[PDB]
Design a protein around this ligand. Structure first.
Ligand SMILES: CCCn1c2c(c(SC(C)C)nc1=O)CCC2
Length: 330
């Protein structure tokens, strides 16, 4: 089997991407944030505290003839941005782009933090990291991909995120029309539960490539590119007037600037992030100071190849017995 679904930016900045997911019988379609940095499939629901729902579409398990309470199971997750959610668990039929999993754990939110409430466009998350990170207790549950994998034509999924445009998540096949050149594959460590890999270096604009190992995670659920402070300083030093602002929480730059590209290494291959992809717009409406899309990972504890980086590539998440990651230009 295979599946193929379009993923759409939630706003004009590509702050996140939503993908429609069918849950239950008859189907209830919710728009979920596919997150290769976490491993829980959770949804706004008829159980979510009413004051914490503000425009999201909810899953109502009592209206699904295939929903079954997973007795005694609870979940609770905290994300890197400080947001959180928690609740109880159903199993139900879940389909993505024509690919169906029966008995998928659907984590129903009883509580969500303010950032989730305030984003009416995201109805929940669909985790695509390794199932060892799943938070369900006392019986840990599998991700949608892990449940689907054995049925897929090939044990892979791909992320093809658009810049200010829709893109695609495919399951079970590699669309050879979706990228240019060849896909370069690179080793993954699953020891932290992530799609963790080592980039071979970077360049800023037309500058020379610096060979240096940068260990980080391929994370579709993180907006920006978070790299070591040395690398980030080297980038922003090429932008007149750019500075790290403690009051804003990172690097900002004059909105009048033309940003340089940023290249990262995948083995001997190179992925080029155009400068425009690094512009996250005014810090507040009407401001001439703009948010940067490359930020320091110092204090996170891990480097994160978020959407800014991934959207410049066609990315293969290879769930073979020994997982690997592939990157191609597009
Ligand atoms: C409503 C503004 C949300 N926001 C956004 C960004 C940053 S980047 C900052 C951490 C350097 N900080 C924010 O607070 C990038 C685009 C949206």
């Amino acid at each position: 089997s295979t599946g193929s679904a379009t993923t759409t930016p939630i706003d004009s900045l590509d702050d996140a991407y939503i993908t429609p997911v069918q849950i239950g019988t008859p189907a209830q379609t919710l728009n979920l944030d596919f997150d290769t940095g976490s491993s829980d499939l959770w949804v706004f629901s008829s159980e979510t505290t009413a004051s914490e729902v503000d425009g999201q579409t909810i899953y109502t398990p009592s209206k699904s003839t295939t929903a079954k309470l997973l007795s005694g199971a609870t979940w609770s997750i905290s994300y890197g941005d400080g947001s959180s959610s928690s609740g109880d668990v159903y199993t139900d039929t879940v389909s993505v782009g024509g690919l169906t999993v029966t008995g998928q754990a659907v984590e129903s939110a009883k509580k969500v933090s303010s950032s989730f409430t305030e984003d009416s466009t995201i109805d929940g998350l669909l985790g695509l990291a390794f199932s060892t990170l799943n938070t369900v207790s006392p019986t840990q549950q599998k991700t949608f991909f892990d449940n689907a994998k054995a049925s897929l034509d090939s044990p892979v999924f791909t992320a093809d995120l658009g810049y200010h445009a829709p893109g695609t998540y495919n399951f079970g096949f590699i669309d050879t029309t979706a990228y240019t050149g060849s896909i370069t594959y690179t080793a993954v460590s699953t020891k932290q539960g992530f799609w963790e890999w080592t980039s071979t270096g970077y360049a800023v604009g037309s500058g020379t490539f610096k060979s240096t190992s940068i260990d980080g995670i391929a994370d579709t659920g993180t907006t920006l590119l978070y790299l070591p402070a040395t690398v980030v300083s080297a980038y922003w030093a090429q932008v007149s007037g750019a500075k790290s602002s403690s009051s804003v929480g990172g690097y900002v730059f004059p909105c009048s600037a033309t940003l340089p590209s940023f290249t990262f290494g995948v083995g001997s291959a190179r992925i080029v992030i155009p400068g425009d992809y690094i512009d996250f717009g005014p810090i507040s409406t009407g401001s001439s100071s703009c948010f940067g899309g490359i930020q320091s990972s110092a204090g996170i504890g891990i480097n994160i190849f978020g959407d800014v980086a991934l959207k410049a590539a066609f990315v293969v998440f290879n769930g073979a017995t020994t997982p690997t990651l592939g990157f191609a230009s597009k």
